[PDB]
Write a protein that binds this ligand. Structure first.
Ligand SMILES: *Cc1c(COP(=O)(O)O)cnc(C)c1O
Ligand SMILES: *Cc1c(COP(=O)(O)O)cnc(C)c1O
Ligand SMILES: *NCCc1c[nH]c2ccc(O)cc12
Ligand SMILES: [Ca+2]
Ligand SMILES: [Ca+2]
Ligand SMILES: [Ca+2]
Ligand SMILES: [Ca+2]
Lengths: 476, 490
């Protein structure tokens, strides 16, 4: 007689969750962003073993409020300025809640036609917003495109499955007896490409000796130099190796550098190498015409991925992978075989609800107002000669630091490094900011990632005042 | 001025979503389990392009109700009898909703301490319910766990760790020796395991699918696995990894975990146990013998999103040595560095998976266990098994049918017997009578049944346990099977 989905529990448990969410957003700014807990704190709060008997849902919610929430890093805080913000929206949450309750597994079209078609629809809609060519689309207005997409869990998964497909294609182009020729395949990316990409290369079985990290410098604002890429790919070809795959990044994690997509595709075309564009974060911006030039040349790459669960108001997980001309690998399906796992949840519903409820114009203004807030912060930094902006700001991420010579406590470039680390730790201890760092050209650098969903312009200005106040009392 | 998380919208959108969920559960039994739509219907109804302007959320919900629901296969229906049911609960739905709204990204402990510490706690609690050997749990232990999205990812990361250890110790020159590694699983192993082998770079010629037969109830014969591994070693290949399944997808065969581990230990091969479905039953003492020998395997995975009332995605991976996983999966990018990670006192769970980012999936799993407790979880397993037993004994009492294999859990395999009537004189005729019984059951909309092949024969699966499903739904399904069968005969 125990019914886990009985009508009363479903309504009252979900109403309590909704109440908690409302209160959480209303009060999250009043909490320290970074929690003041040490490793292991939780097992000293909660029971060591699962309970034998049931408890009222109120007990569970009270432990969430008393023991979970205080040990969280509040990504949702308007004062979260770290990594890339996980932007979100009421429609996305609603869509993921409905997907959880229907709880379908879409491993074939027949296993739920609406879920498969909605994911294809969501992908084709976003592709239009990005102005991707018809070669990346499943359905068009009146017919079929020549491409396809799939909604993956992470950008890493997108890299893996396109690495695997390029790997198997190059193994057969080079007359390999199964994987016997795998030790001749080489792969390439700038040194600013995410480290998870080189990990994906090793997971796919590429040889560590043949995984190339191409050095970048400040003379290209740390974007990949196509001449350096050609030099490396030509040297491998002349040495008997097979250039198999190049990853170009639009909007690197560290400093938001941009690889020149068209020029990278031209260089790789000399060797028939697969080209994948990783635009996990900055891809979202490319739904706006003034950012779409960053994807010029996408029509000549093999695949492209971006993550709505960063900068397009869709909660995790939601990474969109697009593949050109899928014939090289009436029915309506996504690229189901280009995932790690056959059967996972219905991720397309929330992406569609975001697009259907808010529309293109509001998504575009969401991007533009984040960029404008980032420009406000950048111009404030540029107005204080104790600081420097270390690279041009391309999107909504600013990299800045206390420069050497800003005070006696920042006399050398190594003293500036420790001053910037000290500033970051002091900001985080206030609870009114979460700032994290990177290293750019050998220098310790603070990142400032604008765009947390509750964040407004006055939050960014207030963070800048706090940075100024903290720096000033550091220089005594 | 556009604020997607404003308080008014957050409250009313979610209240409309809850009202929809309430209606859905109350009405889903009355819908046909399988939809009646053609491929491509959706973009016809919604449009080919996204809208430029905004719309009230009520319109989004109306398009959900009018265009999406009529095209769904209703996994939540009490009359869904295919694959394995995706059991769910109010607590798991509530946990996932809360996790979606907080929307933290727990790649490191520091990125959100509670997200990682509750996942560890939830894994430890489940390990206790399963009575896993303490070597799988975590101050000198090396065992530990990770929640992943899928069994496929769990197979992938353990295959990669096994591969890297085999290449290292067998003197491979980089990956030049990768074509010498071999892996083994019974032919009843889920096809995603063979796909994960191909993803990791194993040679298709070296991926061994061991035949099984009725002699072992289609479980892996350990003598035949030893034969296959010894032959490969004698030929200069390196036996690298063995996958044992407890509760196979097709007929719920169970591999002998202890004996398989003992065979593979002659070659120092990695042993992984896939208990995706049936692992949840092992929280009950009368089923826990199916995991005997697990103390000698390297890894085991199981999915609460099948039979433990936790909505997708939720798959738990346990290993006896996390260092063998993090050795292959860890990264150390500068922008992620923090003092807690440097101290060695935490495991950043990005180092236990393919990706960097990850949802707070521990919350829903902890909420299920915390709210319902072990005894209710146990009774949930037992009462599904008793419903399957009811259906199995009903099949056994009708001479026109056979139960094709012994029933270990809550899946019954059964068949219109050969020689049951005129439309099933020969076995080739039975194969077509069963395909027509299946397709007719599905056309009524009061059932969804899908088939399998057991020993060359067309077999219907009857997978009991959809969360809304009660015993009278199973008895009524049997009555519908008899009725359709009699009409077929004349
Ligand atoms: C966020 C980020 C990633 C992280 O990838 P996941 O596997 O989805 O966590 C990869 N690439 C870039 C450019 C990123 O900004
Ligand atoms: C259902 C099933 C699977 C499916 O794995 P996923 O990748 O999570 O879809 C794997 N193994 C077994 C035994 C199963 O029954
Ligand atoms: N390199 C970490 C930044 C990151 C990684 N994975 C993510 C998912 C979502 C998000 O907002 C940031 C992020
Ligand atoms: Ca048409
Ligand atoms: Ca904003
Ligand atoms: Ca470490
Ligand atoms: Ca039940």
């Amino acid at each position: 007689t125990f019914q886990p989905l009985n009508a009363d529990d479903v309504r009252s448990y979900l109403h309590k969750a909704v109440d908690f969410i409302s209160d959480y957003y209303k009060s999250v700014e009043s909490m320290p962003v970074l929690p003041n807990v040490k490793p292991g704190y939780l097992q000293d709060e909660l029971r060591a073993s699962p309970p034998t008997y049931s408890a009222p849902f109120d007990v569970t919610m009270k432990e969430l409020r008393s023991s979970v929430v205080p040990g969280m890093t509040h990504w949702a805080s308007p004062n979260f300025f770290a990594f890339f913000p996980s932007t979100n929206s009421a429609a996305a949450i609603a869509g993921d809640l409905i997907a959880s309750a229907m709880n379908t597994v879409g491993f074939t079209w027949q296993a739920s036609p609406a879920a498969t078609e909605m994911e294809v629809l969501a992908l084709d809609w976003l592709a239009q917003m990005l102005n991707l060519p018809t070669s990346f689309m499943n359905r068009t207005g009146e017919g079929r495109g020549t491409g396809g997409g799939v909604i993956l869990g992470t950008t890493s998964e997108a890299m893996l499955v396109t690495l695997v497909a390029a790997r198997d294609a190059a193994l057969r182009r080079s007359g390999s007896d199964g994987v016997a020729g795998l030790h001749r395949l080489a792969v390439y990316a700038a040194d600013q490409t995410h480290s998870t990409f080189f990990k994906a290369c090793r997971l796919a079985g590429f040889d560590p000796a043949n995984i190339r990290s191409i050095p970048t410098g400040a003379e290209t604002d740390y974007g990949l130099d196509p001449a350096r890429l050609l030099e490396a790919m030509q040297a491998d070809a002349d040495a008997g190796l097979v250039p198999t795959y190049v990853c170009a990044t639009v909007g690197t994690t560290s400093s938001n550098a941009v690889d020149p997509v068209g020029a990278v595709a031209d260089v790789a075309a000399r060797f028939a190498a697969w080209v994948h564009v990783d635009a996990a974060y900055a891809g979202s911006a490319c739904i706006c015409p003034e950012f779409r030039h960053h994807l010029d040349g996408v029509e000549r790459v093999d695949s492209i991925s971006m993550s709505p669960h960063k900068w397009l108001m869709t909660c995790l997980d939601c990474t969109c992978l697009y593949v050109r001309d899928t014939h090289r690998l009436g029915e309506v399906t996504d690229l189901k075989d280009m995932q790690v796992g056959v059967g996972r949840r219905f991720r397309g519903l929330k992406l569609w609800m975001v697009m259907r409820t808010y529309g293109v114009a509001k998504l575009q203004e969401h991007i533009r107002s984040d960029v404008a807030m980032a420009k406000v912060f950048e111009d404030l930094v540029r107005g204080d000669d104790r600081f420097e902006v270390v690279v041009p700001r391309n999107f909504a991420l600013v990299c800045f630091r206390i420069r050497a010579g800003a005070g006696a406590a920042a006399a050398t470039e190594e003293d500036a490094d420790e001053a910037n680390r000290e500033l970051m730790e002091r900001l985080n201890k206030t609870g009114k900011a979460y700032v994290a760092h990177t290293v750019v050209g050998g220098r310790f650098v603070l990142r400032f990632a604008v765009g947390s969903s509750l964040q407004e312009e006055h939050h960014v200005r207030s963070a800048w005042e706090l940075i100024k106040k903290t720096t000033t009392e550091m220089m005594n």
